[model samples]
Target chain A: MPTLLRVYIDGPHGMGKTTTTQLLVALGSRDDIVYVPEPMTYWRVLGASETIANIYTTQHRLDQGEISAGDAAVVMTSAQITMGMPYAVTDAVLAPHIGGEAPPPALTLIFDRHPIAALLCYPAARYLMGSMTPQAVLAFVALIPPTLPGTNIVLGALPEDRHIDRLAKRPGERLDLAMLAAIRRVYGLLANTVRYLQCGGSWREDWGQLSGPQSNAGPRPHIGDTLFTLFRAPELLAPNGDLYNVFAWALDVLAKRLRSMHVFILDYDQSPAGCRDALLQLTSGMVQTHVTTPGSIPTICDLARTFAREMGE
Target chain B: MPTLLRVYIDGPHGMGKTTTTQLLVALGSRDDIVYVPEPMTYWRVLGASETIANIYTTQHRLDQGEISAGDAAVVMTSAQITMGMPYAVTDAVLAPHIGGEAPPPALTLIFDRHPIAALLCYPAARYLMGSMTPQAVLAFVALIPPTLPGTNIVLGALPEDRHIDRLAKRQRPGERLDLAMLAAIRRVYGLLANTVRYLQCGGSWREDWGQLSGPRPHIGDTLFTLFRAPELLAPNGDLYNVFAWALDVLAKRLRSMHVFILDYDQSPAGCRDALLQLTSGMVQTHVTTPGSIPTICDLARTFAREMGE
Candidate 1:
């Protein structure tokens, strides 16, 4: 029925992309949504003989439409050779693979961890190492153009904090202020190019609420079924900030998918009024966005009866 | 007399800081308000006999209370040796001068053309040189920790188009995408700051304005003086994102200095409402800001009658 509804579950280290993908995989194979695990990591443990270059070659071919057949497939990797190597690889060797502009969104031949996030986070892992200098920061940031041209969503509005400190314990991962500053500067670089880059002032907002604030502990917006959702407190998302971008993307998905839409804003009457109106305006004319109180309809069954009744499904 | 009201007239190359300061200087010489022309450039033609080590020493002395006697002096430099040097300097060399934390604002002692702007624009001159890598870029950005610690308006609400291309004709004066990109990235870095770091965004309702639409141009409010006159449209002044931050800093200056503020708005409408509101709120309890139409008087004699009236 559908050609390829590609979904990319992306964010900073602890945002539950993998676990969500794992559950989305669900220890089952249905007729739709084929999930590909982090291929770069998989092939590493699978073959001792393969070098990093050999692994890159395999993945590079897969990017040319080799992985999926007729099914709706989703491929992901925390680190991909094409995009993630933060070390000193030349423009000569890496130049041919540069793949300048983003392809049209409909169906991709190319999928990478995203040039913006990788350059920010990957080099951060090694920032304080003797290799760092201001020129390095400038060139690395300059190399990746600011246009985020992809159909997928990247959901890192909140900081990683202890989560990042914990996750980067691996040999290549880096944490601490060096990493955070690196990420901040890169996003700053991103903001410069896009007039309304919209990633907010601080990452400390969500840290106060929700124990652990890592994705696994709290209520999720998307379920395994056809109906998927994502709802963040207004206290957490900024006017046109990154999470707002993710929220807007979700509304965009819901609008086109003809699925049930439920927005639970916690006592969050549009206080900034203009900002709320700005975000709502992004989804207007394109989708039906209904606003409700925190506990208005706690479950999807209730949401379905009230909202889904309108959809033909 | 006052200790030293250290004023730093900092901003991008062109938004009229030098010209504005020239006129301000023309007005008076009280026991206050000393204008120090960009110091580093002076030492340059003074001689190549002086080494880099020598330049820093000249600055180190002035940085001490040595350069001026008490009474409010304004020290400014579009380029300064201590803050502007891009290479071979270490965290240790800069550590003493780094003073990364912003100081409580009263005196205007410390001033340079922004270490952030210098590093962003300087290395960009040689951006495509054989000498570059990710490490270099990071260190370049990292060296000048994102914290800005001074009180001066960084003058750029307008893009550095012909403004930069004309300036960078010399070697390492990169005028391409590199310079433009450098300027943009630095502004974003400034936004993550508490100091008076200035960079304007598009001034449209969606926060996007002007066709390709960025921060709308026009209308501004300010509070301060030996500096109390308002001109320029008073129309497209503040909503120009860059100028709004300039306006914000003027208020920060005003909040500390109890002066009546004069605002110049053309038709006197808040078309780019949110930004105007955001900047206006910065002055709520601070002081009173007055707005008037075009040429309502033009003279303090007339302004005091038409505008001040």
Candidate 2:
């Protein structure tokens, strides 16, 4: 019998689901645990030229028979509610787990804002638990503290902040500030929630302690450190490098973790075979202890076959 | 100077705007009259998969910039009121004819069922004619005789009524007969309208006859024949094949008629070279017209070049 432990990571948009998944893949090298990526992210990036409705329709296809449980599936979504109606994201979350004939026990992690809120209260979670063994854990991330709002004057501003003052005087300064403010708020929320969740404490309690201990109450576990920890990899915090590194890292980690549980990680990208191998090794160790069944063993073997076929291994 | 004509065709659904367009293309070839097919027909058959909404949106594109004056523009439409609003197809009909600094004179032909009932009435026609040239012809394709209620059955029960008996034996034979009835009535109306408008009494009286045909009593021209007479070289009554032929024929004719017309027909099955030749001819004729200036001629030439290149 395999001990199928299903772990879920839940957080707001831009929280480190992707980065964490990448780290797990790096740590675990296995042919078992499968990693599924969110469908919307791929659509959002590739489907930029298409209409939004068409994108939704494609998402519908993925939900309806386009994906199979034998394949590890990961789906990313923004705002589960639309036009006062629940969306297909909920369907994707719940459909695979319904319990008539037990499917290979699977782990599902969702990256969302207010995950705990939705998990406990949103109707979608009940459906998610209906089909599969209900051994699921929801990990929630807390919000980060806000940065300073206005430009610094001579006495108030740090010497390094002088550039902000000069730039704010430019013609398009207001538009720039507005955009920056919006981005900062979004990213700030994301960074804070990811750090809070990965640190393994309740958001409300830990946030309170940090605010009291620190004078400025600046965001703790700095976004970069949180990403580094979640990814279990070196931090790349430079503004210029791949802004998507954290996301990629999370996906990679998840892929590795999935492989450990007899869910195989198929390295779809041609560029990083070595990294994929490393992650597979890390996952195998984590996953092997949980399974003993002959059926489960063969399932993992089938995954290995698939990965080999896809990669020409 | 070459004559400019804008033709508008309108009718209820299944009334045969497509068929009429094909007929007109064929007839136009014989008369040395150039015919341009509506863009939606080609876009639907050849371009990427699209929805009705996409079709409407593409029509708007043609309305905004795809058409020009002195170019005879033919528009086919269903008279269905969209979402309780009247005649959503007006954008395709009126947009090309609007006068900017330079206005092109046009002759407009409309193939329709109850053209007067759906449009000519106040507010609808008033809004439509605002942008078009003064000499617009709103032509109606009258209902075929003995109004049948079931168009699908009539269309489906072909091979000269052989299929009707076979279809009647199947389940829900009554519904099939109703469909056949509707088809017969519509076809009769179309035949009457076409005979009256295109071949019968000369000039203004012909226009009067089209305006007077009502939904209840009079017969009209069939859409298939109307399109055959105007554009299609080989007009079949079958919808898809007729469309295939009309598209090729319309491209050929439109190219010949407009001095500055562009060969923008993107159908792979159609004769691309014929379309290009027709476009070049149209461009040359428009350029040589007496009132045409160098700038206008250049614009016309550019339009054709844009279509070809």
Candidate 3:
């Protein structure tokens, strides 16, 4: 049976993830590789009218104190549900075709972002901006598609100055430096979360670590080092520092969803071609899985291409 | 450890769920039993203004051609999220206190409705009325909290005429009788009960799902089949992945829920007694700790107080 390789290129916008992904896919034959781009058309037109613009405007209004936090949160949460619809559905449909881990595959699928970006990252960032509640963020977290074996997530790392420079060049994009900082912080915490789990840190036992000092000196992955620290806010906890059961369950879901993913950071501070090359090199260490059947390879390939075509502008 | 018996009395509105639930709770000592009423305050005001009325009105408008299906769906979907907030938050908090199924409990929790009413049933009913899309309904399905142990749900049953009559006498300030909605909600609840059995019998959408001649009668007769409408199917005749995934979620959510049918065709007192009699067969589970009983009780009381108008 043939094998399949799935790589997700993800991070905050303006990181050249799309450019890098297209470049990487171009290096392989059409039948051997498929690129699933961001669902830009879905967000901008089909799902809801200009969801990206709506999100930015909602955040801006809240930041400017023109809109209340409650109003902002409603719009943000609803918009996020729209944003994640495609990713969740895609993952659900593709899950059965993906088998256990195996050698490098006969086909490779490069997704622009995993469902977590919509289900976790952006919601967390929005929480930081006060346009989303901690509860709403956790709600999304709980719905994250269970991580499949051989999942490789390529998160981008770029200096803020270089990121802002790239941000200014994107057409009709609103430049929100605050949103940029929030997103970057969330992704950094996400990377730390994966490391925290890999080091055998159990959230159930180490929950007390969050209320303590934000230091890695105490352990390999401090509670502060993971995304779990972000949710230690007063809203999500009891007076005794007990995390609410619901939010704790969500954290459990987060750990399960991300623990199995193979995360590799690609330096996006370089040129697009250089970033693409760095990602290609990272793929060598990434896990690939066997397809369930002979027909799965072509079926997976067509699914990716169709998603990109239907979701692209 | 103390044991907890949670009975969720649920069915279409106007089925006397609240009256029967209150009466059932009255039969137990206040210290040992807690009643978690519908977050009427949350739905009527806190979460959103007049959500129930909004739902009925939206469906009415779509029926009368005053609004488009897309317009009605947006309102219905958003309203559902609002309606389910209290239920979702409560379930999340109460989940940890619930342990595996055990014998009769030291404490009992009788809830007005489970989270699925908002997350699955109502959204699905709205879909049948054309005020909600199958995709939106499935989205709610995916977000359903996992079914925990000892999750005993008692669904109500009633003759359509008596239910409509009851609905008319006790209609909310802004609500009106809509036979169409009544029938739609009735069908949704009926399908929900069958869905649990279909799944428990080892039916799966992933394997031989299209087979009509299986040991399971009406092999394709489940909530999943209800969602295979033209809008959700691709040109290749397969259900869209996004919706199919939601169906998988729906199956998982419903599979483990312990369901009992309460006959609401009787008087309120008779109904309460019937529910109490039915309780003998319901599942009970251990509390996580001795402390969990008080904490769970407090949570239910506080929710009732805060969410009650």
Candidate 4:
């Protein structure tokens, strides 16, 4: 019915992340919006493929902290170590899933923690053989999709642990001393990540100062930012190309017809390398691609333009 | 599943007709065989496009005798002639016709009182316009599609005055003595018409002393003489270029495959004129278009080959 801008907020363990996002979600999933809280990992069990499993594992560890994610496999009595993380999210978000009804389509979906967190975690886990080699980890991190398709992300680091643990009664042990190294690695990963670079919008620490999704509201249409890792899509590639290639073809077909398109490259600098790479490559004389900061999402009228750009209405 | 030998019989009326055919239908519509008693005109209305309607109406007029079919627009102010000949035997056979379940695909359907009667009636009725020239009525008669499709007609004409006028009673009808002349015109029209030339089958005077559908059950397949006055066919154009044309198209498609075909031209001569014309016209090297007046409609095992000429 309408294209939604999916926004994601992520940070390491007890970073005031959940509470802050809950506030964002409360403000965001207002009348016409939706919020899917972190670790949709539970639903992934009923035949989620191995690639999803790999993504799931990478993100689960992000919740554990690099201290947990980076622990040694051979510090002795190795019987404590399992070969791999088993399936499923930890029981913390143990809400009953018996309601088979589908979540309705929404104009915006705000995520408290999303899979893009796995972008940093994957390589953070991959090159974790002994110690992290910064270059190899960065390369691996770059390979992960910045934000999954259409996701425009806003990111944060492992926050100062001053009060996060008190609010997050999460079961696992938080490594208090290892927090410095654990926190620094995430920011380093985020800064180096291309999609996250050119941060847009006013930065608000909490809901009060933050002016939600409301920039360019009057005459101009808004672009919603959402993610489905650009890196994750390559698995379904056919002999021709991956999903982006298919999107390229779709754009080509849509090209001659589209009158005007308002493209929202939210946190493009913060998005993945390929996304910015492909968007930069657009020779389109039609659609206007503009970057929107996370603070000024889009107001109602902008939502109208978003649908018009897509529906040719 | 097996193709059938469609046989048709026709002649001037009342000549021991119904009784003779009773014996014939008795032997015919037996066991697995189907017997379609009279007209199936009701079903014709469903998909009856114009071309089919013209055929239906022209043949439908024959059902009412020249007395009922003919007495209209006549003497003494002629007010006695109603606008229509409402249904009769045509009506007796009728009932609410909702879902007159289609007859199972039958290999044979013997027509009791079919269109050949029209060949005579239409022309006879036509000539009666100041007794319009016989040639014009015959020309008009030829224009009609003789029989409805799937009918193997046994024809009859205006019957003998004796029983018909006697049993049929209450009729100022038949022009009394003119019945003989009325009957003769029908036979006369058949002969002059290239149609009745070689009467298809080796005849059946009645079903009893009759040698039956097989005068030649074995060595040869026969062409039973029926109709084509287009009246004949919706039966067999056993004589037409159309069916031959259709046959060749069928043959060309079946070519690289068929080992042989059992061509049963059952009483084709007795069938409609069109069927034999083309069957007899096969002029080339491949098919044998011979005429065999053989009988008792091909039988059992040969039913397959009975279909196999």
Best by DockQ: 3
Task: Using TM-score as the measure, name the better of candidate 1 and candidate 2.
Answer: 1
Give each prediction's DockQ, rounded to 2 decimals: 0.01, 0.01, 0.18, 0.00
A1-313, model 2: which lDDT tens digit per residue? 4334223332222222444455554454454344333333212221122223432343344446674321111111111111001112222222222222223334322111222222212212211312110111011010000111110000011121332443354300122332233232333333343333434424323322321111122444543322222322112122443312222322233222211211122222222454335433433333212343436545544432332232121
Q: Model 3 over residues A1-313: C-alpha lDDT tens digits?
A: 7888899888888889999888988898877889888888667754556778878887888988998886687677777878888787677668778898985579989998998999899999999988887777876776676687988888888888989888977822478999999999999888888877776778889887667511112345676878988888877676666875545656777787777888888888888899888988888888899878789988888888778767776
lDDT of 1 by residue, B1-309 (tens): 112222233334433333343443332232222233333321232211222333233334444655431100111111222224321121112212323222122122212344444443333222222122222222233223222232232233334454354335421211233354345433432222212221222222222212222232331110111011122012433232212222233323222311111121211132123212322212111101122111111211221121110
In order, what lDDT does every prediction score?
Answer: 0.27, 0.26, 0.78, 0.28
Better of 1 and 4 by lDDT: 4
lDDT (Cα, tens digit) per residue for candidate 2, span B1-309: 432332233221322223333555554453233333333321222111222343233234444666432111112121111111111122211222233211233322222222232322211221232221111111110100111111101111123243343334432211223343334433533343443333322323223334433322221332222332222122332222212222222222122211221121222223233332333222111223444333233322222222111
lDDT of 3 by residue, B1-309 (tens): 888899887878888845665586576447878888777876675445777888778777888899787667766776777777677767766776889878457888988789899888998888888787666676677667778898889888889998998888878756768888899899989888888888888878667456633455354566766776766666777765555656776777789999999888887799877877998988889888879988888878877776754
Q: Candidate 1, after superposition: displacement of residue A184 in Å?
A: 21
Give the per-prediction TM-score of chain B.
Answer: 0.33, 0.23, 0.94, 0.33
True contacts kept of 3: 0.10
lDDT of candidate 2 at residue B125, scale 0 to 100: 27
List the RMSD of every prediction in angstroms. Answer: 23.2, 29.2, 6.1, 37.3
Off by over 4 Å in 2: A1-16, A38-97, A100-313, B1-59, B62-309
lDDT of 4 by residue, A250-308 (tens): 21221211111122222222224433333223212112112232222344324323322
What docking tier does model 3 reach? incorrect
